[PDB]
Design a protein around this nucleic acid. Structure first.
Ligand SMILES: [Mg+2]
Ligand SMILES: [Zn+2]
Lengths: 129, 25, 221, 82, 220, 71, 102, 134
RNA sequence: AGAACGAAAGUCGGAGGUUCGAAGACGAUCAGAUACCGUCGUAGUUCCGACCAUAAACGAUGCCGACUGGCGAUGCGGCGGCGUUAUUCCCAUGACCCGCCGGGCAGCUUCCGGGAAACCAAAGUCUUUGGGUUCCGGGGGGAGUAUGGUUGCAAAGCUGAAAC
RNA sequence: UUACGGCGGU
């Protein structure tokens, strides 16, 4: 009984960083999390990761480094508009130097900055800082 | 006074006033 | 230890075998599976000696990093390794704390016996924990010649040899005092250091005067 | 710490661990900084330089300082490499 | 006319370790009260927060001890919080400053965004829990000011921080725990790995291995 | 645990509208029977005639006769 | 406060056990609360053996035993000293007491 | 009711540790020593010190009690520093090992360098002392 | 919404009646004993059938799912094995011995972490706050009572206020 | 074996 695969994948990384392990095993995989973890690899909180491509939902082995603090999720995937975006940013980010709420738009998965970069808002998906 | 004997002494009461209601209909 | 000068040097393996040193207990920890080769049929677990030699050369690469020779506080509680812990500090120039250790010595700076080192070597982590959890406070690197028995909480360069037997401890201080002077310029690697490993071994009780002079009626008498 | 002018307006640069990468605090009294003194290749004698390692207070107390400093060293020019 | 006994205090009476900034980076245990008075002397203010009469019950009559809550600080971020019991009020509140200059921590002043000048606020949002009191310090926009209860307002004007939001949860009339709870937050500005501090700390030579010469050169 | 999802707000707005009854202030100001209980009935002052000066003794740690009337 | 890690009784995965009754005060307890004490007392009370074994009708006679299982209630276990008020950091053991036969 | 107090036992340890060679196993000798060597106020605690002195003149004349005075300490070097024997209890080249540990020094590759006759240790796996108290 | 099962006591009918024993009858001890103790003893403890849904029904911990220390040990299977021991003078399974793997009641340890603390490998992953979903609680008394509903042969249960 | 009580505010 797995009512979100996103929520429990990012939970397990959050369980392992505070322990401090170099590698995790995200046990189910999808194209909703490999795009997601390539927002925290392209912006450089985690590193290399293999996808163990199996014929069912595969596995992902993520080389942690030690820069990630907490990478939780907002499991009601709330819609949020662009004026509605700033009032999140002082609720679940620490400060406006860093940190990223990452959200799916029709132009793709983006950060909060890349979503306010062009002019698009969509469903919020999670956060990491 | 115990609580299992606060109930019984008022369960003895809630049959008594549930009789004098039936007396004066 | 990746050298040709710092190899295993086959002479000592005939002493590693003959004084225990691959005779642990019968209970591996979760932080010492990497220091083992296999279990015997009688429950005993041997130790791939390339692993305990590469840690021994690494620990001497931590002792030479100390500048003061009179600063490495070498300590011992258990009886096997009380004779050795003294004259190891006479062979390297350290200060020995043999036997019972007063709590409030690394961090109680009022009384007389307050000593503050930069490094400390232990015989056993579990049974001599009192300097370890006092090394919790004075942010000090610790080394311990650990057995498969012992846990590894406050150790840093845990030596996976043996600690129970009398001969297994004294070799491992003799091997260390051989090595901690040979990474200095004391012994020049080819003229072999004659100092005998029986000097460090734990001493039997008082039949000694019976037997030392029973082989000395041809010296004095 | 890199203001908009670009200059260092900050107290001090804090250390970081070599194993668990988290920041060592200013009162974390179980964080050690040890030194591993290497030798020259000809004779195995101390030459004058060394190498450095820091192990923070928690990851020492968690048990695996040595499982750290074996491996960090293992890929960093200290013993066996196989 | 003061003489120490430890390594760190013996190696400061002839003025050889400068500027407390680095004994914070090597994470030393600080021992005496005179090292902290050596560097930051004539740059503290020593104002107390509460004196309460704690007491026990004995064979006859109540042993009335006393309590001193005191916070010391500069105006550029070196605060310390002491707690001490003693049998009399004054010998608690005198000896508490020795215990208050000793648990002294740095604090990192950061920015809210638009980092146009000197730092003014906390680097992020941090917590401090002490039993049941949690103090969530929040970064603040400029020109806002210290917004808190009275007893952390005496410390956030003592860490030099100009403007910082502050909320509290618990029984915040538990003055000493709510005094230590805000101290648990301001002591971990250098425990929160802000993502601009990623590059490898070049390990320099520690003061216990560079000052080995005077360790025994003149003393021993 | 609590009931979150982006279609649920009936569940939250129907779980709320009974659970607001159980504190004193929302029950005494909206059920209406506590608007009948005070003799003022939506007021603060209301006149009355004096019947008899009758005195009550104060509660436990004191001892004095507090003076009252019988409006 | 909770006194023990168990609830005072030696059962976990059940809901009901045998009800038995105590020895001296006959009081009903569950079988896994009560303080047992098995007794293997030498029935002749061995001080009185060199006064019967002359009067035994053999030479090498196995003197019998007596197998009485006292299992007290916990109310009369403490009052007749067969257990003792223990201390809060010497509670946590299930070691049986040492013998001292001589 | 005899047991001598600590200030007797503290002051009569520094006598025996510092003036051991001037003393011996006679009471009346030691009573004049402390008469001359330590400022004692009265006679009653004077000889009561000297009672513990002769009690430890018959004690440390045999055994090493907490008596870190140099004379016995100059003799322990005959025990711990001396006995450097003629042959080691390691180097007789006649040792026995197991068939697993000869694999352990076969990847260490000293098996061609070693004489090392091998005996299999016992067989049946009778270790792990029997569980359950009786 | 609604359903099934639900200790003991209770009611009702018929067998039943050994032991124990509400009530009650005495005998004691008591200032006074309608109680602790003793003999007697009804209803009941027993069965078959038809009821009531209440318990400290307690793990005082809702169900499901994942992740995150170890160590010896245990039960039901399955796997691989030195051997011993069983018709067996040989096998095939049996027993003990040494391991590992899954499920399960549990345990000892641990500055993982949490907490008001007792203490929890969950009460962990929670101000660094959102895996789903169900119920329920808002100072204490009044009170699980007054009433209305509905249920039951009855006892009462379910739903359940306010003044003060 | 038996063994009851202790006015109110300080
Ligand atoms: Mg009751
Ligand atoms: Zn009983």
């Amino acid at each position: 009984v797995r009512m979100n695969v996103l929520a429990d994948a990012l939970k397990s990384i959050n369980n392992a960083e505070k322990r401090g392990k170099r590698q995790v095993l995200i046990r189910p995989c999808s194209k909703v999390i490999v795009r997601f973890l390539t927002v925290m690899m392209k912006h450089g909180y985690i590193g290399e990761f293999e996808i163990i491509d199996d014929h069912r939902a595969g596995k992902i082995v993520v080389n942690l480094t030690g820069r990630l603090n907490k990478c939780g999720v907002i499991s009601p995937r709330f819609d949020v508009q662009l004026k509605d975006l700033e009032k999140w940013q002082n609720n679940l980010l620490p400060s406006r130097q860093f940190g990223f709420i990452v959200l799916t738009t029709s132009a793709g998965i983006m950060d909060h900055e890349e979503a306010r970069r062009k002019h698009t808002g969509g469903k919020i998906l999670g956060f990491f800082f | 006074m115990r609580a299992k004997w606060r109930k019984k002494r008022m369960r003895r009461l809630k049959r008594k006033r549930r009789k004098m209601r039936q007396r004066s209909k | 230890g990746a050298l040709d000068v710092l190899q295993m040097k086959e002479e000592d393996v005939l002493k590693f075998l003959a004084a225990g040193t691959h005779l642990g207990g019968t209970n591996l920890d979760f932080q010492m599976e990497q220091y083992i080769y296999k279990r015997k049929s009688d429950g005993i677990y041997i130790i791939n000696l390339k692993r305990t030699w590469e840690k021994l050369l690494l620990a001497a690469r931590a002792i030479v990093a100390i500048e003061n020779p009179a600063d490495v506080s070498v300590i011992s509680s258990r009886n096997t390794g009380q004779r050795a812990v003294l004259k190891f500090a006479a062979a390297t120039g350290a200060t020995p704390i043999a036997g019972r250790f007063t709590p409030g010595t690394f961090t109680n700076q009022i009384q007389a016996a307050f000593r503050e080192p930069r490094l400390l070597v232990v015989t056993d982590p579990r049974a001599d924990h009192q300097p370890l959890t006092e090394a919790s406070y004075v942010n000090l690197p610790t080394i311990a010649l650990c057995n498969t028995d012992s846990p590894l909480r406050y150790v840093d360069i845990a030596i996976p040899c043996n600690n129970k037997g009398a001969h297994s401890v004294g070799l491992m201080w003799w091997m260390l005092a051989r090595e901690v002077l040979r990474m200095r310029g004391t012994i020049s690697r080819e003229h072999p250091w004659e100092v005998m490993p029986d000097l460090y071994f734990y001493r039997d009780p008082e039949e000694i005067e019976k037997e030392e002079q029973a082989a000395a009626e041809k010296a004095v008498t | 710490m890199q203001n908009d002018a670009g200059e260092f307006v900050d107290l001090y640069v804090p250390r970081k661990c070599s194993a668990s990468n988290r920041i060592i605090g200013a009162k974390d009294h179980a964080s050690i900084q040890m030194n591993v003194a290497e030798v020259d290749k000809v004779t195995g004698r101390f030459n004058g330089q060394f190498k450095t390692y820091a192990i923070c207070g928690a990851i020492r107390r968690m048990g695996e300082s040595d499982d750290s400093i074996l491996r960090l060293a293992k890929a960093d020019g200290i013993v066996s490499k196989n | 006319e003061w003489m120490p006994v430890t390594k760190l205090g013996r190696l400061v009476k002839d003025m050889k370790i400068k500027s407390l900034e680095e004994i914070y980076l090597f994470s030393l245990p600080i021992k005496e009260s005179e090292i902290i008075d050596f560097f930051l002397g004539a740059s503290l203010k020593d104002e107390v927060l509460k004196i309460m009469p704690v007491q026990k019950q004995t064979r006859a009559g109540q042993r009335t001890r006393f309590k001193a809550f005191v916070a010391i600080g500069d105006y550029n971020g070196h605060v310390g919080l002491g707690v001490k019991c003693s049998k009399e009020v004054a010998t608690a509140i005198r000896g508490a400053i020795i215990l208050a200059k000793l648990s002294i921590v740095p604090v990192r002043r950061g920015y809210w965004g638009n980092k146009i000048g000197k730092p003014h606020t906390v680097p992020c949002k941090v917590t401090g829990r002490c039993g049941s009191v949690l103090v969530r310090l929040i970064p603040a926009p400029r020109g806002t000011g210290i917004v808190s209860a009275p007893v952390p307002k005496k410390l956030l004007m003592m860490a030099g921080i100009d403007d910082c939001y502050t909320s509290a949860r618990g029984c915040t009339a538990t003055l000493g725990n709510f005094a230590k709870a805000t101290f648990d937050a301001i002591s971990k500005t250098y425990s929160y790995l802000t993502p601009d501090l990623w590059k490898e700390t070049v390990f320099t030579k520690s003061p216990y291995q560079e000052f080995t010469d005077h360790l025994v050169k003149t003393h021993t | 645990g609590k009931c979150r999802g982006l279609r649920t707000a009936r569940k939250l707005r129907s779980h709320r509208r009974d659970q607001k009854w159980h504190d004193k202030q929302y029950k005494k100001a909206h059920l209406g029977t506590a608007l009948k209980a005070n003799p003022f009935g939506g007021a603060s002052h209301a006149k009355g005639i004096v019947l008899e000066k009758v005195g009550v003794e104060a509660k436990q740690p004191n001892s004095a006769i507090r003076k009252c009337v019988r409006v | 406060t909770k006194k023990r890690r168990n609830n005072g009784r030696a059962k976990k995965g059940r809901g009901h056990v045998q009800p038995i009754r105590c020895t001296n005060c006959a009081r009903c307890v569950p079988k896994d609360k009560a303080i047992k004490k098995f007794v293997i007392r030498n029935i002749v009370e061995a001080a009185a053996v060199r006064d019967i074994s002359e009067a035994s009708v053999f030479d090498a006679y196995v003197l019998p035993k007596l197998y009485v299982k006292l299992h007290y209630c916990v109310s009369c276990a403490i009052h007749s000293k067969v257990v003792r008020n223990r201390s809060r950091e010497a509670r946590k053991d299930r070691t049986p007491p040492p013998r001292f036969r001589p | 009711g005899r047991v001598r107090t600590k200030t007797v036992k503290k002051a009569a340890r520094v006598i025996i540790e510092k003036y051991y060679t001037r003393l011996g196993n006679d009471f009346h000798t030691n009573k004049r020593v402390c008469e001359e060597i330590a400022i004692i106020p009265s006679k009653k605690l004077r000889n009561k010190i000297a009672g513990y002195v002769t009690h430890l003149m018959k004690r440390i004349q045999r055994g090493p009690v907490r008596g870190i005075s140099i004379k016995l300490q100059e003799e322990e070097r005959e025990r711990r520093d001396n006995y450097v024997p003629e042959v080691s209890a390691l180097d007789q080249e006649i040792i026995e090992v197991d068939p697993d540990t000869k694999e352990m020094l076969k990847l260490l590759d000293f098996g061609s360098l070693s004489n090392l006759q091998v005996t299999q240790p016992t067989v049946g796996m009778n270790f792990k002392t029997p569980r359950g108290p009786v």
